[PDB]
Amino acid sequence: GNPLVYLDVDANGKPLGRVVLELKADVVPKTAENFRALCTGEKGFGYKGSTFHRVIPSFMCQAGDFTNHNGTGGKSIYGSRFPDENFTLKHVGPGVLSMANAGPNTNGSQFFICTIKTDWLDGKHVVFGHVIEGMDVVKKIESFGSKSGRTSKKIVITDCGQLS
Numbered sequence: 119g120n121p122l123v124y125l126d127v128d129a130n131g132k133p134l135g136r137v138v139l140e141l142k143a144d145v146v147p148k149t150a151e152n153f154r155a156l157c158t159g160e161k162g163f164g165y166k167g168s169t170f171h172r173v174i175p176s177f178m179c180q181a182g183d184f185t186n187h188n189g190t191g192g193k194s195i196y197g198s199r200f201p202d203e204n205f206t207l208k209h210v211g212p213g214v215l216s217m218a219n220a221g222p223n224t225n226g227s228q229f230f231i232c233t234i235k236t237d238w239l240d241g242k243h244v245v246f247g248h249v250i251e252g253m254d255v256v257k258k259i260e261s262f263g264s265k266s267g268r269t270s271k272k273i274v275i276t277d278c279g280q281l282s
């Protein structure tokens with residue numbers, strides 16, 4: 119079946135809880151696989167110890183720049199960037215999991231979890247999953263963002279992995 123993965127998130131070292139995500143390998147296998155492997159760390163790099171660097175209330179929480187920690191970097195399991203797989207899945211509401219990018223065919227490791235419907239991103243960002251459990255944890259992360267996207271506390275994926 120589709121992978122089930124998790125992110126354990128803290129704020130200045132205090133645990134907020136666990137976000138559980140379904141990855142839609144049945145629709146975007148290559149994008150799902152990238153994220154799955156970056157959660158387990160099996161390629162020798164990934165999300166563990168990296169941050170939510172851009173958190174905008176009423177929009178989204180963005181993470182996955184485990185190279186520069188600031189929204190400039192990241193890399194995929196394939197290489198630095200990989201193509202847009204398809205745009206079949208849409209930004210239908212809160213809890214959508216989607217790839218951040220710097221334009222067409224620039225997927226790396228950065229991603230976002232939506233806290234509203236972000237339909238203006240449809241056909242521009244590859245959606246590849248959604249939140250199964252821990253939307254309340256996402257809402258806690260969101261609480262530490264700002265309209266600038268800067269966070270008021272350091273928000274860290276302390277652990278991550280695959281459940282099934």
Ligand SMILES: CCOC(=O)CNC(=O)NCc1ccnc(N)c1
Pocket residue numbers: 178180189190191192217218219220224225226227228230
């Ligand atoms: C809501 C999603 O917003 C975005 O994706 C806005 N764009 C960005 O943050 N781009 C930065 C970016 C993304 C992916 N790989 C990089 N090397 C750099």
Ligand SMILES: [K+]
Pocket residue numbers: none
């Ligand atoms: K806005």
Ligand SMILES: [K+]
Pocket residue numbers: 158277278279
């Ligand atoms: K782990």
